[PDB]
């Protein structure tokens, strides 16, 4: 019996260009409640959305967001 299983680990075939792997990237998007969109910063972990923050430059997001944006 061994302490852990083998843990295969998968690199890329062509690397993503502007990101260092292991560092989250923040992208600006827009999320609409009733059509009216609030500017969000969405954390890109390894190229997938993980956490929605508020885009600080936007109207209707002066740093923060409502709960539906956070549970998107």
């Amino acid at each position: 019996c061994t302490y852990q299983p083998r843990q295969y680990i998968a690199p890329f075939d062509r690397q993503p260009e502007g990101r260092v792997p292991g560092i989250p990237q923040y992208f600006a998007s827009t999320l609409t409640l009733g059509g009216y969109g609030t500017g969000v910063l969405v954390r890109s972990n390894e190229g997938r959305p993980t956490k929605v923050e508020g885009n600080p430059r936007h109207p209707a997001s002066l740093g923060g967001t409502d709960l539906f944006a956070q549970a998107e």
């Binding site: 083998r6 295969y8 680990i9 690199p11 890329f12 260092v20 292991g22 560092i23």
Partner: protein, 218 residues
């Protein structure tokens, strides 16, 4: 003598002694197995699907480890090399070779070459590579001379003993930068002196802060 024979005293003394010794031996069995090089897979050259040779590439061909592990001083994760990293050389340096059919199967189809993790932590420990190389801890204090490794083995088991040993006495292993220098480096005789100067120079914090639980586990 009514119930028992003459050497019943002998067998009973030997039996109480043997019970004590098998308790001690079972504790020794459990401790040895939990620290064994089989259990933690230490000094075992775990076979990769291509058999990359670090001995041939770094000590012989001579590529620096930031060429392939490009993320070693920026993130927690030292970058595992992609297929394209091999293909800068191996589209010309003996392609149509049997040792690289997996590498040429990747970079044509998108499926990764499924490497096997040699140094493995239990995933709530949160090692950071950038702060180790940036604060004057080089590879071959934690990985050994990888530059001479044809197949890479784990040099030691990643314990809290070992990690807390450097997090309690960082002066014994710190080096005057040159973290990514090849494993031709040797620790000098004045490792206590030069270690204390480099600890005070790099801002290595007191061990009351570096042995905190939320340092590593999170």
């Amino acid at each position: 003598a009514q119930i028992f024979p003459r050497n019943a005293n002998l067998l009973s003394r030997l039996s109480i002694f043997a019970l004590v010794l098998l308790v001690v031996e079972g504790i020794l069995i459990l401790g040895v197995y939990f620290r064994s090089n089989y259990f933690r897979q230490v000094n075992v050259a775990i076979e990769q699907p291509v058999a990359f040779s670090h001995q041939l590439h770094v000590n012989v061909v001579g590529i620096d480890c930031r060429y392939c592990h490009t993320s070693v001083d920026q993130s927690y994760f030292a970058n595992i090399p992609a297929t394209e990293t091999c293909m800068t050389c191996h589209s010309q340096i003996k392609t149509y070779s049997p040792l690289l059919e997996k590498v040429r199967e990747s970079y044509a189809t998108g499926k990764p070459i499924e490497w096997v993790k040699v140094y493995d932590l239990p995933n709530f420990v949160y090692f950071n590579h950038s702060i180790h190389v940036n604060k004057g801890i080089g590879c071959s204090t934690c990985h050994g001379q990888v530059n001479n490794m044809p197949v890479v083995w784990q040099q030691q088991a990643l314990y809290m003993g070992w990690c807390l040993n450097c997090h309690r006495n960082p002066e014994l292993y710190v080096r005057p930068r040159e973290e990514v220098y090849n494993m031709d480096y040797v620790p000098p005789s004045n490792q206590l002196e030069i270690g204390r100067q480099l600890v005070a120079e790099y801002g290595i914090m007191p061990p009351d802060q570096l042995t905190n639980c939320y340092v590593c586990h999170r």
